[PDB]
């Protein structure tokens, strides 16, 4: 462990974002796009979190694997992540599956997508391969995980963090020892084992595996020949590494970038619809759990050119009132009440509206005299005049999609089967 | 006139924006910046108008002449106008006066700045040279002025537009004939001559001269040797061309880009302080005279990455009310009243403020319980708590600078002198 | 026909490059890449021809359709064609077929690829849709084809140019009248009909169709419902437009950009292997048919950062001799004879080589004492020591691929079945 | 010393490259350009060395101080060093002296340039300030000098390296102790003191001072008020820090990046004309002292788009012979002999030339039947037909400039004076 080691491992490293793959539990949010390209934060996409942590961690060589509905994703990487110069060892390579006969190849698993592209990744000559799930929201520093991987003399290093046992049936539960060496790993159990001394919580894998380059190539080619295998990192390989005792665990609180050290680390995978809504409006509160006014760990995105947020008087000459809300650029709010809401770019709300705990994805047009409560308005939805959402549960659940918790989702297809011409 | 002559006139052409110039009528606004680099519109600088008209007119070769306090200007061109490629015949040159032998070189006049850089401009190999004053705000199409210049068989074409005879003592008044050939030109008269049939208005030069390049080079070298010359385009050259009868006039309403054809063309040179303030708030009204939500003639600028505009509750849990205002990105408005105002980037207003007909240039901090009206807050001004501006004119004259019209201007040096340290 | 019309139609236009789709007659040159991504010119790819003609024709909105082996292509557009800003109406959108169920969708035809993406192209709001085959090499101005399309009052406008009847069985042969109105169109005939008064030549379609936006959308939806249709522009639609008499013909000599007006227009589709090799060395001769030292119609590409071309002495201290050859950057030629050749980037040739009428695609390593005549060395081929190519026809045809005209092609797979470790 | 201290020392840091400076020992080379902007290496400028070491050392915040003839320099930074984003904490500022009141401001010395811009540098909020002379050619790692500065608890760390006592009268000679603390510093002595145990060599300052920022600001404001000071870092400040015992020395062989560890570190300041010529041709030899085919420490520059280097046959159909030369892109060499030479971009050599130990800066045209040896041809020089250089020293002294060592220098003004018009 030398003094100039913390700086030379990111440069000998290469990150691989398994962007591609939809989130099925997000219903129609991700019907026309990949989960990493779901909008978030007023101006971000989820994959801006798993990319700006590579940059600020020094890892300037990324590999974005994209399968399902990637036009918007690729078009976002193109416009916001193509400032690189390949001559200074940095790049964001897109690795969709390469078709030679109209659908002959198609990425059978998570770990069968790093094996199709294993002739391109060898050419990078990397020693440490970070394996990032980029449909997640976090502010980690992977040059403090890579060290903890190099100090321990590990082959694979799984970033683990504890979560409530109630939600630990959707993640990879493990069990460690005094030396943070994984002893028992099981993927997506039906009865998540608890931690020792913490019966109400389980030590879960985040989908962030650091691998020596030599061991990963030798483990996938040793796994690609397995017909029985399901070709996934959690469900096939990490048990294989674990059962040889070459798998260590890296606590996330160590390599988490927070502005308040007294707080707990922030991890939201935006699993269902409810946690997507809840995760945006936790940017609109007074004290957000996620700091985005931070200049020591900024998040890079498509810096679209939009005019200032305009607030104008309604048809009656009256004021427009706002409370704990975000209004991004392009918006035009004509004298209506906006509360606990998040308006993204280009949202044009007309007069006399009432908007409460809403999330208005971009290019939404809200017509005159609309009332919106606890809803998610999808991209380009042209809400008609006098529409009421979030006051009649037996109404909203027979028009739009309504989650068990009360969250409504509105899409153009939902609003075009109702008869509202939404071709504006 | 060939049918394919409109599209290859902007490629044989080269624009020269005379960015340098104090614009002394602005008093303290331009103390630390050049007149072009004054902030405008929530996110623009005035030189984004004289540059985005060259782009959308096809003129991709520009030459920005900068002398006085150009650090902010040059830093703006570097970060928002350096997307060009030199192998596609397009660039944004910066031609500030070349310095050797302990600060020897400085331009004697407007036209003694286009001469020193006459060895670099000949390299461009440009047939037509557009000469743009870039301290002006307008939406023109120079590929309709170049045609009118090539149809007429003109050598130099002055863009002229009528203005009230009261303000015509600041511009170049001319007189034309039936075939738009300048007969009488006089620069900055003390008694501006009126138009025929319009006694209340004068036909003024805008500062926009299109030149046959073979004539410009021969005219400046024939002028640079003149010992009594003032080395100015209006004060020396344009009378010389006029007196030979080689000077035509191009009406601006023809080559103006406006979304409402029933309206009059828009020209504001932001002369004094009052017309700066009035010009911004004319973006905050309901029907702006200047359209900036126009996609057929967009304005290019520094697309700074800023978070959404955040509105939060005050100390007391209460709402914040807005009326005909622009709130750009980065702003944080803690539950205060904002009316007829324009907040630029990064403006952090604290609780219980009242803001009326104000313009808050970037990085301004308004403290708790401040009242601001009919004022212009300079960049990074840290307004202290309980400050009151625009209610006692006799008490705003001594503390700050107050125009004759009632407009107040606040700078850090004005506030630092009263002992309100501005170190944030 | 107004005077400012030549400049306003490219802005109301959108180009669609049918890049996607391999060139089967190129054998193994396009086995790991799409034909638009075939290298050409020492530093270009074929799709830099059908893109730089959109830029210099003012068409800044392109749509690159990519299906077969597009990793290289996409990775080229990302690194050399992503300098655009979407806020000044300009972009290069990549439109690969969007998969929702692992190969469910896959682009059944050339005109069934503009129909899958017909919800994205409507959003561009474009009046004139240029349909460009981008597997071709030419220097055309599409703002002189668009006019000739607007003057004639046409619906569709097929760029046609005469070719020898011998090769006219691979293109779309048509037949026109006095008003350049197509009368008889047949796609890929077995007996190409000749021209009137030129029995030895046929009037052939280039794959460059300009279409009013309103007619194209109504023609593909009216064609997508046809089960009998083969979904192709030539084989299905252009006969349908022709049989209604709405199809005009635009001669290519009019809208061709040449630097010698006495010459004939340059069109090479790089059909077979022989014409690819012939087409590059026609850059190496003394008077190229294709001018690439032209600054009035430059070609934009991935401006890779490479050191100067180094020529060094061989093991014996001797000179290296060159004759009518192109040596791009990165190359290291150790004192060998290079004749009528084209070396791309990074080509390291070792001592005592002899290279004649060769094309060395990038990262090729030629070992010591090699002789190469009339060959095409593919990307990254590690030629071993003492290899001899192009002197024994019955030898080179049993090792590598040898066309009927004598041209040899060398790939890594060909040189790894022969036992030469080529993993360098 | 923390294990994560090497990687967050380049982020709390800010580099200041003093680009301005005539470098008068170069005579006519730097007549029209600054010493930093002198061309080097076939494609680089000297300031690409002092900048790519900040990038690859993690220092992404640079401050380029430019005074003398900076148009080419600024135009280079604009086109090759303006890929940075201000929201990711990285930029390349240009801090030329601010001008108001008819050319008033000009820096009195090296250290009176970092003071005027002391209101802009405090905004950076930098703990460590690297002070780089950028008129020098070396491959250093400043994140190994910053650590050595933070281990030692030093305030200011001077990078020192030994040089022959013959040339030690041009640099800052010092004397150190066991713990590398400067005891005696004297700037540009007339009798450079020797090292202990190495009588033939002196321990010289490179011009590379690392500073505690809290100490720099307090040292320049405490120096700017000095009436007898010369306002220089070596001549005024570094003796002041030395005499307090707060000045440590950092050996350059530790923080040098070299591909052959058995070699000595590479430092060439290109002092006179002879060491400029010798320094370039040391790129053309077989084993360069400076490695530029190194991918672990690449040099970033203006990646100009140029065609491949073309070699063609002469008038007579004959070959062109090369020996240990560099031919960059754009060159066209018509069958002539080139030996031990360095041709930059766009050099068009005509037939029957003989070129030996020459350096042809860009856009040079060599005419037919020219003989050139041991000379330096200035940018855009149009050598006429049958010119002979470097065979008659008595006839090259009068026509051009000839050093005492035998090196010739050719400029356009030297050739224009002999009546060889240089207008191409
Ligand atoms: N203004 C719009 N109207 C309708 N659909 C859109 C609009 N903008 C984007 N889309 C589509 O909405 C889907 C999701 O895109 P995005 O919201 O950008 O991920 C894609 O099918 C887009 O092509
Ligand atoms: N946050 C800030 N605080 C104080 N001065 C600033 C700040 N930002 C820019 N300036 C200075 O304000 C002046 C005008 O800059 P600008 O408003 O950008 O034209 C220049 O002297 C800048 O360096
Ligand atoms: N240095 C290399 N060695 C082996 N294969 C390569 C190399 N560079 C690119 N390739 C591959 O060669 C194929 C063609 O790429 P390209 O020649 O860039 O179109 C692709 O499969 C690339 O991944
Ligand atoms: N083709 C050219 N012909 C004559 N002068 C040039 C040319 N290119 C650049 N220069 C001038 O040469 C001087 C040095 O420029 P540079 O060699 O780029 O540092 C400056 O005065 C440039 O404007």
DSSP-derived pairing of the beta strands B332-334 and B309-312: parallel
Whole-number Å distance between alpha carbons of A132 and A208: 5
The pair phi, psi for residue D334, each rounded to 5°, is -85, 90
Whole-number Å distance between alpha carbons of C366 and C369: 9
Whether A346 is in the pocket of ligand 1, judged by its Cβ within 6 Å, is no
Find the radius of gyration of the CA atoms of chain C: 23
Q: Whose CA is nearest to atom 20 of ligand 1?
A: A32
Cα B284 to averaged position of ligand 2 atoms, centre (Å): 25
Please check whether residue B52 is in contact with residue B299, taking contact to mean a CB–CB distance below 8 angstroms.
Answer: yes
Please check whether residue A78 is in contact with residue C78, taking contact to mean a CB–CB distance below 8 angstroms.
Answer: yes
Collect all residues of chain A within an 8 Å Cβ-Cβ radius of residue D55. Answer: 88
Quote the crossing angle between the two packed helices A71-80 and C71-80, to the nearest 10°.
Answer: 30
Atom of ligand 1 nearest to the CA of C119: 23
Please check whether residue B210 is in contact with residue B250, taking contact to mean a CB–CB distance below 8 angstroms.
Answer: yes
CB contact under 8 A, A303 and B303: yes
Please check whether residue C109 is in contact with residue C230, taking contact to mean a CB–CB distance below 8 angstroms.
Answer: yes
Please check whether residue A341 is in contact with residue A326, taking contact to mean a CB–CB distance below 8 angstroms.
Answer: yes
Please check whether residue D136 is in contact with residue D48, taking contact to mean a CB–CB distance below 8 angstroms.
Answer: no
Whole-number Å distance between alpha carbons of A225 and A248: 26
Atom of ligand 2 nearest to the CA of B412: 4
HSE-CB at A25 with a 13 A cutoff on CA atoms is: 11
DSSP-derived pairing of the beta strands C365-366 and C348-349: parallel
CB contact under 8 A, A102 and C99: no
Residue of chain C minimizing CA distance to A109:
C102
User: Tokens representing A172?
Assistant: 């990879």
CB contact under 8 A, D321 and C321: yes
Selected from 3.40.50.970, 2.160.10.10, 1.10.274.30, 1.10.3720.10, the CATH number assigned to the domain covering C294-424 reads: 2.160.10.10
Please check whether residue C13 is in contact with residue C131, taking contact to mean a CB–CB distance below 8 angstroms.
Answer: no
User: Tokens representing C17?
Assistant: 């490059």
Please check whether residue B132 is in contact with residue B48, taking contact to mean a CB–CB distance below 8 angstroms.
Answer: no
Please check whether residue D311 is in contact with residue D320, taking contact to mean a CB–CB distance below 8 angstroms.
Answer: yes
Cα B119 to averaged position of ligand 4 atoms, centre (Å): 9
Resolution value (Å, 1 decimal): 3.2
Whole-number Å distance between alpha carbons of B410 and B399: 9
Whole-number Å distance between alpha carbons of A202 and A370: 44
CB contact under 8 A, C286 and D313: yes
- Reported residue count of chain C is 424
In chain C, CATH 2.160.10.10 covers 294-424
Please check whether residue D321 is in contact with residue D333, taking contact to mean a CB–CB distance below 8 angstroms.
Answer: no
Angle at B80 between CA B74 and CA B81, to 5 degrees: 75
Whole-number Å distance between alpha carbons of B167 and B189: 11
Q: Write out residues with Cβ below 6 Å of ligand 2.
A: B 32-33, 37, 72, 363, 379-380; D 120
Q: Which residues contact C111 (CB under 8 A, 6 or more apart)?
A: C220, C223, C231, C232, C233, C236, C237
Burial B212-223 (b: 16+ CB within 10 A, else e): bbeebbebbeeb
Whole-number Å distance between alpha carbons of D407 and D375: 5
Whole-number Å distance between alpha carbons of B177 and D281: 67
Collect all residues of chain A within an 8 Å Cβ-Cβ radius of residue C95. Answer: 71
Residue of chain A minimizing CA distance to D84:
A83
In 3D space, the residue among C113, C8, D74 whose CA is nearest the CA of residue B297 turns out to be: C8
- Select the residue of B1, B58, B85 nearest C7 (Cβ to Cβ): B58
Going by the DSSP 8-state scheme, the letter that residue C166 receives in this structure is G
Whether D356 is in the pocket of ligand 4, judged by its Cβ within 6 Å, is no
**Residue appearing with tokens 């990487």:** A77
**Residue appearing with tokens 């042969």:** C173
For chain A, the first-to-last Cα distance in angstroms comes to 62
Whether A72 is in the pocket of ligand 1, judged by its Cβ within 6 Å, is yes
The burial of D227, by beta-carbon neighbours within 10 Å (0-12 exposed, 13-18 middle, 19 or more buried), is given as exposed
Q: Where are the strands (E) in B258-404, listed by range?
A: 309-312, 320-323, 325-327, 332-334, 337-339, 342-343, 348-349, 354-356, 359-360, 365-366, 371-373, 375-377, 382-383, 401-402
Alpha carbon of D87: minimum distance to chain B alpha carbons (Å): 6
Give the containing element (helix H, strand E) for B250: strand B247-251
CB contact under 8 A, D71 and B100: no
Closest ligand, as measured to the CA of D118: 2
Going by the DSSP 8-state scheme, the letter that residue A140 receives in this structure is B
**Residue appearing with tokens 């006429």:** D384
Please check whether residue A402 is in contact with residue A277, taking contact to mean a CB–CB distance below 8 angstroms.
Answer: no
CB contact under 8 A, C82 and A78: yes
User: Tokens representing A98?
Assistant: 């390469």
Going by the DSSP 8-state scheme, the letter that residue A159 receives in this structure is E
Q: Which residues contact A167 (CB under 8 A, 6 or more apart)?
A: A271
- Select the residue of D3, D88, D147 nearest A55 (Cβ to Cβ): D88
Collect all residues of chain C within an 8 Å Cβ-Cβ radius of residue D55. Answer: none
Whether D379 is in the pocket of ligand 4, judged by its Cβ within 6 Å, is yes
Whole-number Å distance between alpha carbons of C57 and C130: 12
In 3D space, the residue among B95, B111, B103, B17 whose CA is nearest the CA of residue B62 turns out to be: B17
DSSP string across C377-418: E-TT-EE-TT-EESS-HHHHHHHSEE-TTS-EEE-TTTTTTT
CB contact under 8 A, B95 and D71: yes
In 3D space, the residue among C234, C250, C245, C54 whose CA is nearest the CA of residue C157 turns out to be: C250
- Select the residue of A6, A83, A295 nearest D7 (Cβ to Cβ): A6
Chain breaks of chain D after residues with C–N above 2.5 Å = none
Residue to test with chain D: of B65, B103, B104, most D Cβ within 10 A: B103
Find the radius of gyration of the CA atoms of chain D: 23
User: Chains that contact C by 3+ CB pairs under 8 Å?
Assistant: A, B, D
Give the containing element (helix H, strand E) for C63: strand C61-64
The pair phi, psi for residue D62, each rounded to 5°, is -120, 160
Q: Which of B46, B72, B348 to mutate to test the pocket of ligand 2 (most atoms within 8 A of CB)?
A: B72
Residue B293 CB neighbour total at 10 angstroms: 11
- Select the residue of B301, B308, B319 nearest A323 (Cβ to Cβ): B319
Q: Whose CA is nearest to atom 2 of ligand 3?
A: C380
DSSP-derived pairing of the beta strands B382-383 and B365-366: parallel
- Expt. technique: cryo-EM
Cα A25 to averaged position of ligand 1 atoms, centre (Å): 20
Q: Which of D32, D74, D344 to mutate to test the pocket of ligand 4 (most atoms within 8 A of CB)?
A: D32
- Select the residue of B41, B323, B326 nearest A309 (Cβ to Cβ): B326
- Select the residue of C87, C99, C305 nearest A87 (Cβ to Cβ): C305
Cα B379 to averaged position of ligand 2 atoms, centre (Å): 6
Give the containing element (helix H, strand E) for B79: helix B71-80
The alpha carbon dihedral of D210, D211, D216, D219 has a sign of negative
Determine if residue B115 is left, alpha or beta; phi over 0 gives left, psi from -120 to 50 gives alpha, anything else beta: alpha
Report, at the CATH architecture level, how domain C1-293 is classified: Alpha-Beta Complex (3.90)
Burial C214-233 (b: 16+ CB within 10 A, else e): eebbebbeebbeeeebebbb
Whether A373 is in the pocket of ligand 1, judged by its Cβ within 6 Å, is no
CB contact under 8 A, D67 and B99: yes
The alpha carbon dihedral of C54, C56, C57, C60 has a sign of positive
Collect all residues of chain A within an 8 Å Cβ-Cβ radius of residue D88. Answer: 55, 298, 300
Cα–Cα distances (Å) from B391 to A178, A384, B323, in that order, read 70, 45, 20
Residue of chain C minimizing CA distance to D343:
C308
Whole-number Å distance between alpha carbons of A59 and A84: 12
CB contact under 8 A, B309 and A300: no
The pair phi, psi for residue A355, each rounded to 5°, is -130, 125
Whether B120 is in the pocket of ligand 4, judged by its Cβ within 6 Å, is yes
The pair phi, psi for residue D207, each rounded to 5°, is 90, 20
In 3D space, the residue among D383, B398, C275 whose CA is nearest the CA of residue D408 turns out to be: D383
| DSSP H helical ranges for A138-224 | 145-151, 213-224
Whole-number Å distance between alpha carbons of C55 and A367: 40
C391 labelled ligand-binding: no
CB contact under 8 A, A3 and D4: no
3-state secondary structure chain D: CCCCCCCCCCCCEEEEECCCCCCHHHHHHHCCCCCCCCEECCCEEHHHHHHHHHHCCCCCEEEECCCCCCHHHHHHHHHHCCCCCHHHCCEEEECCCCCCCCCCCCCCCHHHCCCHHHCCHHHHCCCEEEEECCCCECCECCCCHHHHHHHCCCCEEEEEEEEECCCCCCCEEEECCCCCECCEEEECCCCCCCECCECCEEEEEEEEEEEEHHHHHHHHHHHHCCCCCCCCHHHHHHHHHHCCCCEEEEECCCCECCCCCCCCCCCECCCCHHHHHHHHHCCCCCCCCCCCCCCCCCCCCCCCCCCCEEEECCCCCCCEEEECEEECCCCEEECCEEECCEECCCCEECCCCEEECCEECCCCEECCCCEEECEEECCCCEECCCCECCCCHHHHHHHCEECCCCCEEECHHHHHCCCCCCCC
Q: Which residues contact C136 (CB under 8 A, 6 or more apart)?
A: C46, C49, C50, C206, C207, C267, C268, C269, C270
Going by the DSSP 8-state scheme, the letter that residue B98 receives in this structure is P
Q: Where are the strands (E) in C83-191, listed by range?
A: 91-94, 128-132, 156-164, 172-175, 184-187
Whole-number Å distance between alpha carbons of A31 and A110: 20
Residue to test with chain A: of C83, C87, C102, most A Cβ within 10 A: C102
User: Tokens representing A47?
Assistant: 């994959």
DSSP string across A8-34: TTTTTEEEEE---S--GGGTTTTSSS-
Q: Which of C32, C43, C44, C302 to mutate to test the pocket of ligand 3 (most atoms within 8 A of CB)?
A: C32
Please check whether residue C365 is in contact with residue C415, taking contact to mean a CB–CB distance below 8 angstroms.
Answer: no
Q: Which residues contact D299 (CB under 8 A, 6 or more apart)?
A: D44, D48, D49, D52, D292
DSSP string across B220-245: HHHHHT-SS----IIIIIHHHHHTTT
Collect all residues of chain B within an 8 Å Cβ-Cβ radius of residue C3. Answer: 1, 3, 5-6, 147, 151
Closest ligand, as measured to the CA of A100: 3
């Amino acid at each position: 462990d030398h003094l100039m080691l913390a700086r030379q491992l990111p440069l000998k490293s290469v990150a691989l974002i398994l962007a591609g793959g939809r989130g099925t539990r997000l219903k129609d949010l991700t019907n026309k796009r990949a989960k990493p390209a779901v909008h978030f934060g007023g101006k971000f996409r989820i994959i801006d979190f798993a990319l700006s942590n590579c940059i600020n961690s020094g890892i300037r060589r990324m590999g974005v694997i994209t399968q399902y509905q990637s036009h918007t994703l690729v078009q976002h990487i193109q416009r916001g992540w193509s400032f690189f110069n390949e001559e200074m060892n940095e790049f964001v390579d897109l690795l969709p599956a390469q078709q030679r006969m109209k659908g002959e190849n198609w990425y059978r698993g998570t770990a069968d997508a790093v094996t199709q592209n294993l002739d391109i990744i060898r050419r990078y000559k990397a020693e440490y391969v970070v394996i990032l799930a980029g449909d997640h929201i976090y502010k980690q520093d992977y040059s403090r995980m890579l060290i903890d991987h190099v100090e321990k003399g590990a082959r694979c290093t799984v970033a683990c963090m504890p979560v409530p046992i109630e939600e630990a049936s959707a993640f990879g539960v493990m069990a460690v020892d005094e030396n943070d060496k994984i002893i028992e790993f099981v993927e997506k159990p039906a009865n998540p084992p608890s931690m020792p001394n913490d019966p109400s919580k389980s030590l879960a894998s985040m989908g962030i595996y650091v691998f020596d380059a030599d061991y990963l190539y030798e483990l996938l080619e040793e796994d690609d020949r397995d017909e029985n295998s399901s070709h996934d990192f959690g469900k096939d390989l990490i048990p294989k590494i674990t059962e040889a005792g070459l798998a260590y665990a890296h606590p996330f609180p160590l390599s988490c970038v927070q502005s308040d050290p007294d707080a707990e680390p922030y991890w939201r995978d935006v699993g269902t619809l409810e946690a997507y809504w809840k995760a945006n409006l936790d940017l609109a509160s007074v004290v957000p759990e996620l700091d985005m006014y931070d200049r020591n760990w900024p998040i890079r995105t498509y810096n679209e050119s939009l005019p200032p947020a305009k607030f104008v008087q309604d048809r009656s000459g009256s004021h427009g009132m706002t409370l704990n809300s975000l209004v991004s650029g392009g918006c035009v709010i004509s004298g209506s009440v906006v509360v606990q809401s998040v308006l993204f770019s280009r949202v044009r709300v007309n007069s006399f509206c009432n908007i409460d705990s809403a999330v208005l994805l971009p290019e939404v047009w809200v017509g005159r005299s609309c009332r919106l409560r606890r809803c998610v308005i999808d991209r380009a939805c042209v809400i008609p005049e006098g529409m009421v959402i979030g006051e009649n549960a037996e109404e909203d659940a027979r028009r739009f999609y309504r989650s068990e918790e009360g969250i409504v989702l509105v899409t153009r297809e939902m609003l075009r089967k109702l008869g509202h011409k939404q071709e504006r």
